[PDB]
Amino acid sequence: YDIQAWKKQCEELLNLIFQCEDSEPFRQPVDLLEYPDYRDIIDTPMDFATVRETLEAGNYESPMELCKDVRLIFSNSKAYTPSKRSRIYSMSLRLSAFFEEHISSVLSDYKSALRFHKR
Numbered sequence: 001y002d003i004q005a006w007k008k009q010c011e012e013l014l015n016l017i018f019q020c021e022d023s024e025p026f027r028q029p030v031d032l033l034e035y036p037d038y039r040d041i042i043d044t045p046m047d048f049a050t051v052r053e054t055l056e057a058g059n060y061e062s063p064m065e066l067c068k069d070v071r072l073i074f075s076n077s078k079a080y081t082p083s084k085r086s087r088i089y090s091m092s093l094r095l096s097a098f099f100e101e102h103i104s105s106v107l108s109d110y111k112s113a114l115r116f117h118k119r
């Protein structure tokens, strides 16, 4: 019932994601010389460095907000991909499965902690 425990859990999950080769493309902004149409397709860029930064600045109030930004990384990849079989999109889908598998307990424990607080 630790209301604050999600933050370190999310830091540790981000560490795992940064160790994962699949996160490579999703660590930093898109170079518009390499992908000139990116910001035509993608209004709201997100990468894992921005997520980690936001977390470490104390600018997430809950793991749900972090989860919204991470999911934006994945939905941006799905919007930008020219094919459902592209290399980078395929990396996004594996990483998304990994993230969802690991974040599920973090969200459950946080929401449990908030309900116990309100009890």
Ligand SMILES: O=C(NCC(F)(F)F)N1CCN(C(=O)c2ccco2)CC1
Residues within 6 Å of the ligand: 024, 025, 026, 027, 028, 029, 030, 031, 034, 035, 076, 077, 078, 080, 081, 082, 086, 088, 089, 092
């Ligand atoms: O250039 C980058 N990342 C920055 C870098 F290279 F420094 F890591 N990206 C990731 C986001 N994109 C995609 O989701 C995508 C789907 C299909 C093809 O690309 C575009 C390419």
